[PDB]
Amino acid sequence: MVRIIVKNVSKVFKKGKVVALDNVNINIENGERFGILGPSGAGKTTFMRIIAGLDVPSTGELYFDDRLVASNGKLIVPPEDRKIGMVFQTWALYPNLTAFENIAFPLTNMKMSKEEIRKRVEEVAKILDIHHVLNHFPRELSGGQQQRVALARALVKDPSLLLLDEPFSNLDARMRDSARALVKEVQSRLGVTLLVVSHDPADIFAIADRVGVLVKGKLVQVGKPEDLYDNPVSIQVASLIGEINELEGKVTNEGVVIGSLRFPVSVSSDRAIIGIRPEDVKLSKDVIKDDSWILVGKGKVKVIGYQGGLFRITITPLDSEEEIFTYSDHPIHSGEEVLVYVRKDKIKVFEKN
């Protein structure tokens, strides 16, 4: 319901010594599901707090629709006037308050009567399917129920924007799938603009329609998840969005050489970094007669693993320590020599310089 325009936003700490965010530019569309991915310390929470209005840009401006909300160290529209709901990385339900009281809390000074408060809480409780446990204390609720109460609390003032800072971190795995689905269902039910942050890529493919990657305070790439996956601007972005094999080779007239392997791509530097995802590699004991796979050379199996019902096969080129891993329904014993094939249009190459 609200468009977020981030114009040249920077944020410093330690009197300037630490640049948490450096000239960030992004336009998040109204009603969009937007994700931010980046390593620990990249500036995700700092970004979220600036959007929430809990902090301000040191330089630059922030607009909600055409409304200036912060500018160069000044808060123009305070958090309480921004129509935002948040579930922060270290969110906590008040242990001594029931679910009702936890959800009602944000309404205490909103000039609404007891009846108006009850009606609003029950309404959002129904949306989150926890209307039946409103009288329970948080310790009496399941993990899923707790997450629902936290969401209801963030949605009780009818916000236009919902901010989630690493929401599915306190989850095991079965719960994560469920929690991700819930976030999507309630974003649909209310139409809110949604910003979610994480150092975990699974949440991004699950929830986000567009994603921004933050590295050391810099927004290095923005695009649809599949765009970042297939066309990463760097090997670092490549690895953040998904598994990838990273190899360093010498640039040659014929291609990039890594031991006995030769990849048919080129850059400019004398050295190159090759990125190849596991699904874009295939191993074989004989030549593959398929124009969709390209032979890059011989390899030797180093070790095999077994996870997720699949075998993880790790090989190295002849005369190299560089590893390449892939997944297969069938195993190949260590020490066996194999032909290594790749999807050519899927080879990612970057300068080492």
* 44 has binding-site annotation: yes
CA triple 44-45-47, angle to 5 deg: 65
Secondary structure string (H, E, C) spanning the chain:
CCCEEEEEEEEEEHHHCEEEEEEEEEEECCCCEEEEECCCCCCHHHHHHHHHCCCCCCEEEEEECCEEEEECCEECCCHHHCCEEEECCCCCCCCCCCHHHHHHHHHCCCCCCHHHHHHHHHHHHHHCCCHHHCCCCHHHCCHHHHHHHHHHHHHCCCCCEEEEECHHHHCCCHHHHHHHHHHHHHHHHHCCEEEEEECCHHHHHHHCCEEEEEECCEEEEEECHHHHHHCCCCHHHHHHHCCCEEEEEEECCCCEEECCEEECCCCCCCEEEEEECHHHEEEECCCCCCCCCEEEEEEEEEEEEEECCEEEEEEEECCCCCCEEEEECCCCCCCCEEEEEECHHHCEEEECC
Our CB check for Mg ion shows the closer of 45 and 316 to be 45
Interface mask toward Mg ion for 7-46; x: CB under 5 A = -------------------------------------xx-
What length does the chain have? 353
Q: Which of Mg ion, ligand ANP, none sits in contact with 41, Cβ below 5 to 8 A by type?
A: ligand ANP
**Pairing, β 4-13 against β 59-64:** antiparallel
Our CB check for ligand ANP shows the closer of 41 and 264 to be 41
* Distance separating alpha carbons of residues 66 and 300, to the nearest angstrom: 60
| Tokens (6 digits) for 194 | 């949604």
Task: Please report how close the Cβ of residue 107 comes to ligand ANP at its closest, in angstroms.
Answer: 29
Our CB check for Mg ion shows the closer of 48 and 349 to be 48
Task: Please report how close the Cβ of residue 167 comes to Mg ion at its closest, in angstroms.
Answer: 12
Task: Please report how close the Cβ of residue 39 comes to ligand ANP at its closest, in angstroms.
Answer: 7
Task: Please report how close the Cβ of residue 89 comes to Mg ion at its closest, in angstroms.
Answer: 5
Residue 198 interacts with Mg ion (CB under 5 A): yes or no: no
Residue 20 interacts with ligand ANP (CB under 6 A): yes or no: yes
* 326 has binding-site annotation: no
Residue nearest to Mg ion (CB): 45
Residue 201 interacts with ligand ANP (CB under 6 A): yes or no: no
Stretch that binds ligand ANP, among 38-46, 91-99, 243-251, 326-334 (CB under 6 A): 38-46
Task: Please report how close the Cβ of residue 129 comes to Mg ion at its closest, in angstroms.
Answer: 29
* Distance separating alpha carbons of residues 4 and 51, to the nearest angstrom: 8
Binding to ligand ANP (CB under 6 A): which residues in 64-93? 89
Residue 320 interacts with Mg ion (CB under 5 A): yes or no: no
Residue 22 interacts with ligand ANP (CB under 6 A): yes or no: no
Our CB check for ligand ANP shows the closer of 16 and 309 to be 16
* 234 has binding-site annotation: no
Residue 200 interacts with ligand ANP (CB under 6 A): yes or no: no
Our CB check for ligand ANP shows the closer of 40 and 268 to be 40
* Distance separating alpha carbons of residues 79 and 123, to the nearest angstrom: 24
Q: How many residues line the site for ligand ANP (CB under 6 A)?
A: 14
* 40 has binding-site annotation: yes
Residue 18 interacts with ligand ANP (CB under 6 A): yes or no: yes
Residue 169 interacts with ligand ANP (CB under 6 A): yes or no: no
| Tokens (6 digits) for 347 | 């080879």
Task: Please report how close the Cβ of residue 79 comes to ligand ANP at its closest, in angstroms.
Answer: 16
Binding to Mg ion (CB under 5 A): which residues in 35-94? 44-45
| Tokens (6 digits) for 72 | 């160069």
Our CB check for Mg ion shows the closer of 45 and 145 to be 45
Binding site feature residues for ATP: 40-46, 89, 166
Binding site for ligand ANP (CB under 6 A): 13-14, 18, 20, 38, 40-46, 89, 199
Binding site for Mg ion (CB under 5 A): 44-45
